Amino acid sequence: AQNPNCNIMIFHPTKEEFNDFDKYIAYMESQGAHRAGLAKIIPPKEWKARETYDNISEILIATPLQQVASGRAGVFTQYHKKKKAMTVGEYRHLANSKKYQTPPHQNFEDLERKYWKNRIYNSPIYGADISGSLFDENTKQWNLGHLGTIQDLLEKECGVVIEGVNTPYLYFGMWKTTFAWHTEDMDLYSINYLHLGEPKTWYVVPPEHGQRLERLARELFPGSSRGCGAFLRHKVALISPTVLKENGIPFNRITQEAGEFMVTFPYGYHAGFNHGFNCAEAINFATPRWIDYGKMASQCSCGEARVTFSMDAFVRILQPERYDLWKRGQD
Numbered sequence: 001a002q003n004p005n006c007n008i009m010i011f012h013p014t015k016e017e018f019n020d021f022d023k024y025i026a027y028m029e030s031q032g033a034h035r036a037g038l039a040k041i042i043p044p045k046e047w048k049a050r051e052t053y054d055n056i057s058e059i060l061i062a063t064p065l066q067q068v069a070s071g072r073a074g075v076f077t078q079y080h081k082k083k084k085a086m087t088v089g090e091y092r093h094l095a096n097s098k099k100y101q102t103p104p105h106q107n108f109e110d111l112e113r114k115y116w117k118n119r120i121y122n123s124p125i126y127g128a129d130i131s132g133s134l135f136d137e138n139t140k141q142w143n144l145g146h147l148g149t150i151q152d153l154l155e156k157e158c159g160v161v162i163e164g165v166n167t168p169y170l171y172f173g174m175w176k177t178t179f180a181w182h183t184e185d186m187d188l189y190s191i192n193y194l195h196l197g198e199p200k201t202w203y204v205v206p207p208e209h210g211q212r213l214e215r216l217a218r219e220l221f222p223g224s225s226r227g228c229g230a231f232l233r234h235k236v237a238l239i240s241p242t243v244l245k246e247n248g249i250p251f252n253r254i255t256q257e258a259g260e261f262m263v264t265f266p267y268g269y270h271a272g273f274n275h276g277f278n279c280a281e282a283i284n285f286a287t288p289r290w291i292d293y294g295k296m297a298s299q300c301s302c303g304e305a306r307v308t309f310s311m312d313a314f315v316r317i318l319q320p321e322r323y324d325l326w327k328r329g330q331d
């Protein structure tokens with residue numbers, strides 16, 4: 001069995017290997033990369049996402065989100081308070097202000113210590129979930145707006161044609177902006193490209209151990225667990241690496257830098273934070289190996305998790321017994 005300790009693997013494809021996206025994902029899995037839940041892909045030196053980032057300041061962040069925490073430093077939830085619209089130029093200036101900028105630090109480990117010590121005492125503002133792309137249309141390799149769609153994968157594997165579309169999303173971050181513990185919708189893959197700016201630190205639980213994280217979360221968030229049998233789908237709960245180690249939960253960590261791709265694999269729980277002003281692009285995708293995870297994915301029916309139009313069909317075809325109840329949640 002390849003990668004039996006479930007370590008995060010780092011790949012350096014050549015320009016020739018970068019041509020065929022599906023084939024390279026399958027290669028990485030042949031080496032055991034999926035067992036970690038997360039892999040890093042460093043593009044060949046010949047590749048670029050676009051020519052420059054000099055002209056992005058007029059992108060609008062229609063609904064910036066202030067991430068307000070409750071709890072203790074290592075075990076907390078966050079809620080998203082909606083703020084007034086601002087441009088990416090306005091948000092970058094805000095991120096760099098004395099109230100929100102990254103503190104002085106020695107290295108990524110010192111900054112990680114500072115994040116876990118102090119996160120709860122501040123409320124950073126995240127420009128998340130913005131439909132769009134920063135890849136140049138002429139970038140032919142690993143262009144996250146030109147991937148094969150999940151609807152087409154389902155159709156190719158299972159024969160059923162379904163409605164829905166699959167497009168990328170932009171994320172503009174600042175120091176302390178936080179992504180809560182989650183798997184993807186319908187336990188899909190994700191791919192995330194850090195276009196510019198400061199790093200993003202990730203934490204991940206191997207897919208084979210995901211239920212250990214769920215059991216800890218039910219213990220640590222006992223009211224939320226009674227409310228919803230899949231409350232991690234709400235994407236609000238944080239648990240620190242120190243707390244995970246104290247409870248014996250297997251996990252790994254890695255820091256993504258500008259110019260690097262990360263891939264999350266089906267049922268790989270992940271969480272993390274941004275080091276300072278940055279911009280990432282991400283999208284969900286599927287392979288043949290996803291189908292069995294999609295069939296088994298948990299679902300939130302309490303009404304909180306509220307998701308895309310295109311998840312309807314995935315539930316309806318892969319999980320017809322759950323369909324009715326899930327759809328009641330969404331209406």
Ligand SMILES: O=C(O)CNC(=O)C(=O)O
Pocket residue numbers: 171178179190191192264270280282283
């Ligand atoms: O970058 C973020 O805030 C969160 N991203 C993801 O969870 C991902 O790419 O799957």
Ligand SMILES: [Mg+2]
Pocket residue numbers: 055056057058059
């Ligand atoms: Mg612009």
Ligand code: NI
Pocket residue numbers: 182183184190264270
């Ligand atoms: Ni994710």
Ligand SMILES: [Zn+2]
Pocket residue numbers: 227228229230231233234300301302303304305
């Ligand atoms: Zn729920």
